[PDB]
């Protein structure tokens, strides 16, 4: 017999991929776009835009 | 690294003359395309043409710029 | 060949039947129309 | 041993006149006190006096290979000297291993 | 000290779908409207 | 590993080409002649429409031989093959080329001269 | 606009590669050649700045290439533009298909 | 000294290629003013076409 | 050391730009941002008549 | 003459540099191919010919 209220946790496993990184003039991040998870994704890092 | 490269100072003399060479012929480029003409004519200050509208590409006063009114836009559009 | 170290060969944008048929276009407008239809409108 | 927010000179270090050897690539002793380094750190062991020649970037060997591996960007410097009257006595001192 | 629990009735555990999370600042310096890529270790999206 | 139509003299166990590549073996099992060739051609490419248009793109590959379609320039991948003609944009190769068309996706076919 | 566009990146790209070849290290146990004379005697670096000065003459050979390239084109245009403003400006070009 | 010999190569090969890209080019360019000229109609300038 | 206008995260201690040179970096003590500027420009010219 | 005399006297300076190419060590120990050789042993003068 016990009570633990509500509670959700998620517990997820770093990988080492490049990912693009966006700064703006204040300089935190925005957005960030991976270069292995979608051929689209991969073009945006590839021209750096 | 200065005195190792009195053994590369041979290489860095064609490099700074490449470039001297590109530099002065970048110059040059602009002389053979617009100084065609060694006269400066002044835009009359009658506009009448017999119809046509000259205001878009000869520069107006309004501006401190020299620049037309598309030449602006020109200038505008590429960084 | 010469593709088999990595060193491709990248095929042409227009192969040589579209070019073929640019030169019959161009060589039928030329008997055609003479100059008017690299200028314009194609006369006859 | 891992020396951090602390203040470490080397003149002190030179000027003993007890050490019998000193292979030490980090700088010139002129300078290498005028620029700065992140982290000193120190591995202090024991060895034969057959041994100290094989500790050098790009040798082989039994120890060198087998206990402490040189890089050959080793600016690690190695200090050695003799202290065979306080480690070492009569029937045999076999405290050290390798 | 510890105690031990008993044997009760547990559900099994889930899985969702990240959506652009675990992103985080890969190094301490600034960087201003600048677009550059890194090499660490990442969370990926939509994993 | 093809089967050649080449035979070797019986003396030699490799073979070479113009290029000096050796493209040439012989089996020591019962003596039959095959080619080699390597497998991996040319590299990968990505069509995208553009931005503000779409967001699907189009996976191509250069000399890999193979939704799917098996163009002159490699497989095109992700884009639909279409018999009309009409002009395009995109250039993929070998008078074929790529286009956002009609919902709406991508499309390949035949540029229209 | 393209041709007055792609001067200018083609510049920009080429003159950030001339930043990002000194983030290399061309065989080299550093990139800067600070470093290595700090934590290294200079009769023993004398390698690893050599290999620098080389990987570095050789990078600024080949950006001259292109520069040399570039200049070459540009003054092909140059002169196309020279004869576009002396023949469709100044008078009327009887050259079809040219103005 | 095998990735310094592969790659002077290289660029040695790429060096030519720009140049002949070059000349190729500018034959191209003499041949579509051939073709705005001598076959879109009558040139004046004798000796040309 | 110019007095800048841009105010860094307080967590950064270096500052870079586009073209990825450390021109801006905050002071430990007095958490200051003075950018970098170098003083060397360009050679000389010798006008001769 | 402008365009007449570049276009010999670049020639002629590009002439005269691969000479002065010659006189430099190029981070070895000596200009001249046959010092080394005359001096030192071919097996460990290699690297300087190389
Ligand atoms: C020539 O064309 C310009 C177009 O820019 C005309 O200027 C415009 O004139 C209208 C009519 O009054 C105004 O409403 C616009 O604001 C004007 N635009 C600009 C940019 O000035 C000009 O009137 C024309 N001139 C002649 C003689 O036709
Ligand atoms: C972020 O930048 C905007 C300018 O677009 C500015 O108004 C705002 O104050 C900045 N945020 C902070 C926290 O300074
Ligand atoms: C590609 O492979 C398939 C099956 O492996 C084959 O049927 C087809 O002929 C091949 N394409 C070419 C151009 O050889
Ligand atoms: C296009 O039309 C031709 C007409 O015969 C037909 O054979 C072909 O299959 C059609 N293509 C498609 C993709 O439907």
Redesign the pocket.
Known sequence: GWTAGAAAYYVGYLQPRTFLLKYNENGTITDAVDCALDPLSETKCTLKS | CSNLLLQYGSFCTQLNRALTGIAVEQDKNTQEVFAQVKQIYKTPPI?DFG?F????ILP?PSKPSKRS?IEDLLFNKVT | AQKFNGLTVLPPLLTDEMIAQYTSALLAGTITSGWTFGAGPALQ | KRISNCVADYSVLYNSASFSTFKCYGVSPTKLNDLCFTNVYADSFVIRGDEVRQIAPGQTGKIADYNYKLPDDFTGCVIAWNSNNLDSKVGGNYNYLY | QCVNLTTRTQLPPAYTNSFTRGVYYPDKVFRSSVLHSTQDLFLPFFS | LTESNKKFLPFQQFGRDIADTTDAVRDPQTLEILDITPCSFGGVSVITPGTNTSNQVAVLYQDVNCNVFQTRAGCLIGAEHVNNSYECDIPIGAGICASYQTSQSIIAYTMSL | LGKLQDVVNQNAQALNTLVKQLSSNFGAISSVLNDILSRLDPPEAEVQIDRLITGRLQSLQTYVTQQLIRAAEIRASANLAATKMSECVLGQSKRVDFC
């Open positions: 506009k119809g509208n000259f205001s878009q107006d009114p």
